[PDB]
Structures are given as structure tokens and as C-alpha cells.
Amino acid sequence: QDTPINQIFTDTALAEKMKTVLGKTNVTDTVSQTDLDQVTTLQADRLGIKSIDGVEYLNNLTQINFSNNQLTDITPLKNLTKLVDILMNNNQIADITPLANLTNLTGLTLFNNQITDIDPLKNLTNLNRLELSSNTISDISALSGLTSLQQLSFGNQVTDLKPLANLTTLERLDISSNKVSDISVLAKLTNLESLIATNNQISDITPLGILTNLDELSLNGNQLKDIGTLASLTNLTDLDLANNQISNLAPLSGLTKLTELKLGANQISNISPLAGLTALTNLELNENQLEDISPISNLKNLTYLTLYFNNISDISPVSSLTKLQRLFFYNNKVSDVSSLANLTNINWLSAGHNQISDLTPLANLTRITQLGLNDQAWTNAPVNYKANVSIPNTVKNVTGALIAPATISDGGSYTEPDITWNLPSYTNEVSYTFSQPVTIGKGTTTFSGTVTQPLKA
Amino acid sequence: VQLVESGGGLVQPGGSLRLSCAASGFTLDRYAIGWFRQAPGKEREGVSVISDTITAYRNSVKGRFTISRDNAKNTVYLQMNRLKPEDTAIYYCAVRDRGRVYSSTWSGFGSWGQGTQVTIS
Ligand SMILES: [Cl-]
Ligand SMILES: [Cl-]
């Protein structure tokens, strides 16, 4: 018979949503099984829904969205066999048995849930899109017959990728955050264009060598050392190899279509192989063992560059990079920043923890909105100990004005431009600090540092 | 990802203390590891960071503190010498994923431990 809306849909937030779908005024208004069969789609995301009790009566649903709610039970879906697309990411679903017979599904999105058992998916052979990442899946057996899949993601405990053998239609695969070391099966997925394998245990990438249609590859956070196989993948435009143990970059030298290359957190001391990758706009080389960055002078299209946490003394090869917008090189050994002076398109400069004493070359970088210059530190060349040592202050702000020491060791004092100590007896060093707020464009920072003066006996 | 700080205590001005940041449930090789501290009514502030073998230190502790790792023990240490009253604080360790990019030495840290109280009389 004609029931009230809120006795079908027992969940308060869904009752209220269905009221609006059905063109009614209150959630107590009654509706017929005919008013219900009018409803073929339902966008009910982020509405705080806890239960979909009532949805079984919307027999003609072809497409639903219940993402970003608090669903646990999805039994109401069991017999809505006209469903072709389900979006239900970001809930608390564990049991997906109710999906087992919805064989007309072409799209199923379930990432960010609590699913372990995916056996109920095994007969959904019309799926071309299946998203299962950020779940607790360890066994992907049930996938072996879903041969029409073009996009697939899953996590987060899979070791055995063999069930993927016949999924040869796959173009996009995300196996991020699993426990995979053996990727032999991926040799069979020759139509892959995008492979995301962040955060696994992969050391042998030989299987990828014939995946020549890959344009996007991430092996971020794996166990890579030898990357020789990547030389085959000449269609790559986007490559992430960050957080591995890579030192030899020769295999990348011919990958001239690369516009993005992430190599941070590796064992790299020679970037000569990168010299010909002139299409690069983003290059990340933080957390390596770099000193010589001369090959970077050829990469004229670079807009973003990271070099932080390296052993770099001379930054000057960057002077030709006129399109640079972001440059992070904190924690290096740079003293002279005169090579940065004509990089006027920089809006973000992060140069703390260097050996910078003179900011005057930064004065015309007026598109800066973010700036970091703290915690500089250097050691002067030793001078011979005597009771009265004085050294010049060389610390200059963006104006060219000397910055007066903030602290001076061993009771010393300052009379511009000189710092003077009176030392009773031998000490093997003196020091001073400086600390001054500075603004360049609209970016504000503390320019601070410690200068050490060794004293020889 | 679980971090545990220990080694805090009461110490005389000019004295020394060694903190340990013991990590369990993940390889420390995948993370940069940072020591932070927070004094009463102040912001939590970075003290030192190690990423692989490269280290960084806030100005006020340069020359006095040394961060180091024992990879065998999955532990990061902060050697604090010539301690001053200004170094009084609860000391915390945290990590950040070395596979990302960060705009500063101190940004992006998380998985904070319980902390260890350092008091200089
Ligand atoms: Cl029914
Ligand atoms: Cl910054």
C-alpha cells in the first residue's frame, strides 16, 4: 500500500533526501510503488547516512552514489539488478555479498572501506572499473575472470598478483600500499598506460620492460636500485622513483618525453644522465648526495626544482632557469646566491640551513610570496689566537645594510663593522649569531645563523 | 608506525643528556626523523632532523646537539650537551615520508610519540 516516506527509508538523512527526490513537502507524506519506480539515479553523497534500508524499493536504479557516508550494511542493494554504476567509497563497508548478483555492473568504486573478502565480485564480469584501494584485501583470486577491466585499484595486503594474468584490457592499475615484491605478472598487461605501485617492496622491475605504452609510472617508496629496464619505456612523461636506493641514472638519459621526474630520497651523486631531458618542468632531487648540479643548466623549462638535503656548495647552474617558480634547496652548503638574482619568476624560495651571509642578490625577486632563510651556519678560516681578536661582520640584509650580531660568545662586543673579543687565555674558537626578520615581495622569514671562528694555538 | 621517546630527566645547567626515539612497525630508512620540543605556553618547535645521513639543527642548538641513528636498533638519538634553561621542554620525535616534498626542514612531521620531559634547573 502507499507507505509514509520515513517508514520505508528508516534513516533520517536519507528520508529527507528522498522527500526531495520524490517532489514531496514532508518526510511523513505517503508515496506509491509507482512514485518510487520513477527514480533511476540517486546522488546521496556526504549526507551522514547510516543505513540504506528502503533502497530495495527503488527497483529501477541504474546509478547510485552513497560515498562519504557511514554505511556498514549494504543488503538493500541485493536485488537492484539494473545497477550499472555504484560509488560507495569512504564508508565502513566490510561485507559485500549483496553485490554478488549485480552482474550488469560496469563501474564499482569502494575505496576507503573495511573490505577483506572480495569473493562476491567474481561473477561481475562486465566490470571495466573497479576501485578497492585503502581496504584490507590480501587475496585477489576473485578478480581473475574480470577480463573487461580497464581500471583497477586495490589494497592493502596483497602479495600475489598472479590473478591479474588475463586482465589484459587494463590501462590503469594502482597497487599502491600493498606487500608486493614480485611483479612478473605485469609483463602480460601490455596495454597499461598508467601504473602506480607506491609503497611496496619491489626491487626487480624487469617485467615492465615491454610495457612500452606506459606514460605514467610510480615506484615511489620501493626497494629499487638497478633501473636499467626503464630505458625501454620511451613513452614515459611522468616518472616517480622517490624514496628508493637508486644511484645510476644512465637508464633515464633517453626518456626525453619526461615532463615530471621525482628522484628525491635516493643515492644519487651524478645527474649528468638528466642533461638531455629538456622537456622537464618538475624535477625533484632532494635527499641525495649531490654536489655538482651543472647538468641542470640545460633544463630551461623547469618551473619547480627541489635540491634540499644534499651536499651542494655552488648553486650557480640554476641561473639559466628563468621560468623557475619554486626552488627548495634548504640544508646545503650554498654561500653565494648571486646566481638567483635574475630568476624573477620565483614565488617560493626555501633556502634555510645554508651558509648564506648576503641577501642583496635577492632584492629584485618581488614575486616571492613564501620565503625561508633561517638557520644558516658557517665556519671562517682559522686565525692565530691572540688576546685581542677582531673579525669583520659580513652579514648583509636585502638592503645591503650590515646586520648587528644578536649574540657574541666569550663576552665579545660589536662596533660596526667589527666584532672584538678580549680573551684571557687560549680558546679553540669564538662565535656569534644573527637574527633579523626579512621581507622579499610578500614573503617573510627570519634570516638567522651562527658564525664560528676557529683559533689556532 | 609507533615512536617512543626516552632519556629525559632533570639536569644541571651545562650538563648533558641523551634522548632516544625508538621506532617500531616500519623501516626508518623510508622516513626523515625529527626531534621537536614544546615548553609551557609555547608552540612546538623543531630542534633537529636526520634524513639518511644528512642532519639539520635549529640555530639555538647548533654546536651543542647531535642527531644520529643506529639502523640495527631502529632508533634515532639526540645528544644534548651544554644544556641551558631555555632547553627545558617536553621533547617529541616524529617522522615524515621521504617520498614526498616539503617546503621546509620542519614541515609535514607526524606519528608523534608521547614525549620525554627535559628540565634544566
Ligand atoms: Cl521490492
Ligand atoms: Cl618556507
Breaks in chain A (C–N beyond 2.5 Å) sit after none
> What chain B residue is nearest to A263 in terms of C-alpha separation?
B99
Compute the residue count for chain A. 457
> For the domain that residue A193 is a member of, what is the CATH number?
3.80.10.10
Contact at 8 Å (CB) between A235 and A257? yes
Q: How far apart are CA A337 and CA A440, in angstroms?
A: 14
Q: How far apart are CA A442 and CA A367, in angstroms?
A: 8
Contact at 8 Å (CB) between A321 and A293? no
Contact at 8 Å (CB) between A362 and A336? no
Residues A192 and A259 in one domain: yes
Domain hosting residue B115, numbered range: 2-120
- Pull the grid cell for residue B112: 608523534
Q: How far apart are CA A436 and CA A416, in angstroms?
A: 16
Name the residue facing B59 among A328, A348, A448 (closest C-beta): A448
Counted domains in chain A: 2
Name the residue facing B56 among A331, A370, A372 (closest C-beta): A331
Task: Find the ligand nearest to B105 CA.
Answer: 2
- Scanning A62-159, the segments in alpha helix (DSSP H) are none
- Pull the grid cell for residue A317: 647552474
Determine which of A291, A305, A307, A331 to mutate to test the interface with B (most B C-beta atoms within 10 Å). A331
Touching check for A307 and chain B: CB below 8 Å?
no
Phi, psi of B95 (to 5 degrees): -135, 160
* Cross-chain residue pair A433–B59, CB shorter than 8 Å: yes
> For the domain that residue A415 is a member of, what is the CATH number?
2.60.40.1220
Q: How far apart are CA B49 and CA B79, in angstroms?
A: 13
- Pull the grid cell for residue B86: 631555555
**The three-state (H, E, C) secondary structure of A362-406, written as one string:** HCCCCCCCEEECCCEEEECCCEECCCEEEEECCCECCCCCECCCC
Q: What is the dihedral of CA A380, A384, A385, A390, to 10 degrees?
A: -60
The residues near A130 (Cβ < 8 Å, ≥ 6 apart) are A108, A121, A143, A146, A149, A151, A152, A153, A154
> What chain B residue is nearest to A286 in terms of C-alpha separation?
B101
Distances in whole angstroms, Cα of residue A210 to Cα of each of A248, A250, A337: 21, 19, 45
> For the domain that residue B114 is a member of, what is the CATH number?
2.60.40.10
- Pull the grid cell for residue A35: 512514485
Experimental method: X-ray
Residue with cell string 669583520:
A392
Question: What does the buried/exposed string (b/e) look like for A109-133 if buried means 16 or more CB atoms within 10 Å of the residue's CB?
Answer: bbbbbebeebebbeebeebbbbbbb
Contact at 8 Å (CB) between A369 and A352? no
Q: How far apart are CA B50 and CA B69, in angstroms?
A: 8
In a domain, A19, yes or no: no
Residues A199 and A285 in one domain: yes
Counted domains in chain B: 1
Name the residue facing A450 among B54, B63, B99 (closest C-beta): B63
Amino acid type, A273: P
Q: How far apart are CA A113 and CA A453, in angstroms?
A: 59
Dist. CA A372 → ligand 2 center (Å) = 4
Write the burial class of residue A435 (CB in 10 Å: 0-12 exposed, 13-18 middle, 19+ buried). middle
Touching check for A433 and chain B: CB below 8 Å?
yes
Domain-ending residue, one of A279, A309, A333 = A333
Name the residue facing B54 among A220, A331, A431 (closest C-beta): A331
Q: How many CB atoms lie within 10 A of CB A28?
A: 12
Residues A305 and A387 in one domain: no
Contact at 8 Å (CB) between A296 and A321? yes
Contact at 8 Å (CB) between A146 and A168? no
Contact at 8 Å (CB) between A418 and A392? yes
Contact at 8 Å (CB) between A447 and A397? yes
Furthest-apart CA pair in chain B: how many Å?
41
What is the separation of C-alpha B54 from the centre of its chain, rounded to a whole number of angstroms? 14
- Pull the grid cell for residue A268: 644519487
The residues near A107 (Cβ < 8 Å, ≥ 6 apart) are A84, A85, A86, A87, A127, A128, A129
Cis check: omega of the bond before A156, within 30 degrees of 0 = yes
- Scanning A22-156, the segments in alpha helix (DSSP H) are 33-36
* Cross-chain residue pair B32–A330, CB shorter than 8 Å: no
Return the CA Rg of chain B: 13
Compute the residue count for chain B. 121
How many Å from the N-terminal Cα to the C-terminal Cα in chain B?
Answer: 34
Residue with cell string 632563510:
A373
Residues A397 and A323 in one domain: no
Residues A296 and A193 in one domain: yes
> What chain A residue is nearest to B28 in terms of C-alpha separation?
A243
* Cross-chain residue pair A353–B105, CB shorter than 8 Å: yes
Contact at 8 Å (CB) between A261 and A248? no
Domain-ending residue, one of A304, A333, A362 = A333
Distances in whole angstroms, Cα of residue B9 to Cα of each of A322, B28, B117: 52, 26, 6
Residues A323 and A404 in one domain: no
In a domain, A398, yes or no: yes
DSSP lists the bridge partners of residue A154 as A132
Residue with cell string 645563523:
A449
Summary count for chain B: helices (H), strands (E): 0, 10
Domain hosting residue A389, numbered range: 379-456
The residues near A20 (Cβ < 8 Å, ≥ 6 apart) are none
Dist. CA B105 → ligand 2 center (Å) = 9
- What residues of B are in contact with residue A308 (Cβ under 8 Å)? 102, 105
Dist. CA B91 → ligand 2 center (Å) = 23
β-pairing, A304-306 vs A282-284, is parallel
Q: How far apart are CA A353 and CA A332, in angstroms?
A: 7
Distances in whole angstroms, Cα of residue A397 to Cα of each of A231, A349, A408, A414, A445: 47, 16, 19, 17, 12
Residues A304 and A386 in one domain: no
Amino acid type, A446: T
In a domain, A153, yes or no: no
CA nearest to A163, candidates A177, A182, A191: A182
Domain-ending residue, one of A279, A306, A333 = A333
* Cross-chain residue pair A242–B58, CB shorter than 8 Å: no
Dist. CA A437 → ligand 2 center (Å) = 14
In a domain, A145, yes or no: no
The secondary structure of residue A428, as a DSSP letter, is: S
